[PDB]
């Protein structure tokens, strides 16, 4: 159904399925729980595009509805964050949550710093957009796969895609395998930021700051 795709067809499918870059309700007039309110609102609207995005990810539709729900519940913040650090890649020392919401660490500071470190890591590696969409698709399918074997077969297809990209970039066989490793090890740090971020959001709802109703369902999924 989706295992008969070439590397270039895989890239094209992922690229065209990319969600739009949404805007925040940020008004430079207004004067710091306001920030989290803007971020909460922003993430709430991004989730709707992410859900329809995940549907266009090869193999995801083949999975059952119960499995689709689980994978998204576990990786939604990972996908939001890797999206953020990708958009902030051309903005050193700043996080581009929205085109009108560019923030530095001064304006939770360690969550910001970790996101900033990931973005600078991408910029150093000169992460390509073709490699990014692969990574984001890997997170979706991998993060909750351990709570058939169809998902692993798709993950291997994305791996072949990454290698095919690095081969066209002129990297040696050794250079391809090294870069592949470097990219996947960043997913460990992405999981880390997601877990810490999830805990921060967990304590914010109890303090009240007002969370979205969809977000409350995604948040309780981590118990």
């Amino acid at each position: 159904l989706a295992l008969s795709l070439t590397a270039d067809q895989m890239v094209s499918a992922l690229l065209d399925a990319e969600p739009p870059i949404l805007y925040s309700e940020y008004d430079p007039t207004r004067p710091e729980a306001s920030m989290m309110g803007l971020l909460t609102n922003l993430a709430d609207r991004e989730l709707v595009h992410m859900i329809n995005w995940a549907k266009r990810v090869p193999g995801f539709v083949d999975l059952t509805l119960h499995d689709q729900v689980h994978l998204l519940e576990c990786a939604w913040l990972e996908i939001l964050m890797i999206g953020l650090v990708w958009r902030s890649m051309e903005h050193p020392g700043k996080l581009l949550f929205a085109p009108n919401l560019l923030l530095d660490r001064n304006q939770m500071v360690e969550i910001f710093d970790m996101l900033l470190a990931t973005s600078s890591r991408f910029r150093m590696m000169n992460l390509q957009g073709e490699e990014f969409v692969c990574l984001k698709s890997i997170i979706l399918l991998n993060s909750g796969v351990y709570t058939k074997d169809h998902i692993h077969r798709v993950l291997d297809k994305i791996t072949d895609t990454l290698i095919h990209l690095m081969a066209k970039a002129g990297l040696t066989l050794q250079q391809q395998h090294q870069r592949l490793a470097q990219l996947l090890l960043i997913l460990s740090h992405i999981r880390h930021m997601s877990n810490k971020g999830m805990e921060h959001l967990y304590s914010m709802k109890c303090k009240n700051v007002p969370l979205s109703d969809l977000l409350l369902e995604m948040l309780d999924a981590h118990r």
């Binding site: 709707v48 859900i51 995940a54 549907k55 509805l65 689709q68 729900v69 998204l72 519940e73 109703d213 969809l214 369902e217 995604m218």
Partner: peptide, 9 residues
């Protein structure tokens, strides 16, 4: 589940 609804259609 809102996620389940939105994933259905």
């Amino acid at each position: 589940k809102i996620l389940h609804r939105l994933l259905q259609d």
